[PDB]
Amino acid sequence: VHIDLSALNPELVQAVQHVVIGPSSLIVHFNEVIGRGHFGCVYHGTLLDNDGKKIHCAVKSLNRITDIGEVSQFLTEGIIMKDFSHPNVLSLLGICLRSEGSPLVVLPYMKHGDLRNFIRNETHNPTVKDLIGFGLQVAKGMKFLASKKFVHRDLAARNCMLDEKFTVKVADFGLARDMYDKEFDSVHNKTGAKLPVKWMALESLQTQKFTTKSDVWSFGVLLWELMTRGAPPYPDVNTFDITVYLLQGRRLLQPEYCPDPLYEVMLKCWHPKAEMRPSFSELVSRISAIFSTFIGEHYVHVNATYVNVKEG
Ligand SMILES: Nc1ncnc2c1ncn2[C@@H]1O[C@H](COP(=O)(O)OP(=O)(O)OP(=O)(O)O)[C@@H](O)[C@H]1O
């Protein structure tokens, strides 16, 4: 990937200067891979603060941003994202604008990793309260993004991170855009198996457009992930034909430990009409009420070999 930085709009280059982190401020430990996902690779990094204090960070390469036009748009979004501050939204510390690679985002290192692994771990023992509480934190972070008219596009439990205080931080907002654009219009992905279709709203699968209302659908799937302690949604449905599955009149089953009013909320998030789905503001209100009724005595028991659903 070669990016001709002299081909960027001068006013943009000036406008994003305060977001850009230079090589003398950042070491990316490329031999210390954290992992790879849908649209990038994450590495350990070391950032210097204003006082020259050493800061542990995570650095993500955005590998599907490969062309000047895509870099340009990303920079505009970087300026917007840098200004976000909310306890349930992962900070953007800055960006690396490279001439010989895809651009990087510099993120605070999240001590306790992602929410999906945190709940899946068999040595952890979450209660219904704990799981709903995590969902409330995610709803709050999404309520903030929605207030900024900022579409996530890749919301899922894997993209909610936990910091040293166990505060949930919604992560990877906006960054899936170019990967989606390319994979929707690729002769190598006509099946759609390269995309996270299990979290996508019906209308997003059909139209390739993403909105805050489509994030609400993803949030419903995220709640299902929470209440099953990280089960994979819809096993053996990983293609655009999830649309066929959905249109037969189907939704994810109620997890055994999912309270009835929370399952009602999930069904609202998957309303066929996007405009009839609750806002994140409404979701925070409703989930705060359901959360308040629990006292942390109902341990959620799951097993690796199957998903336990409501039966009695
Ligand atoms: N700020 C961070 N601190 C620590 N680990 C991180 C951070 N950001 C991402 N990771 C981890 O790096 C790995 C890869 O992240 P990446 O975001 O590319 O994939 P993902 O989150 O699994 O899926 P997606 O591509 O849908 O985001 C994951 O293990 C992820 O939890």
Ligand SMILES: [Cl-]
């Ligand atoms: Cl409980």
Ligand SMILES: [Mg+2]
């Ligand atoms: Mg991610």
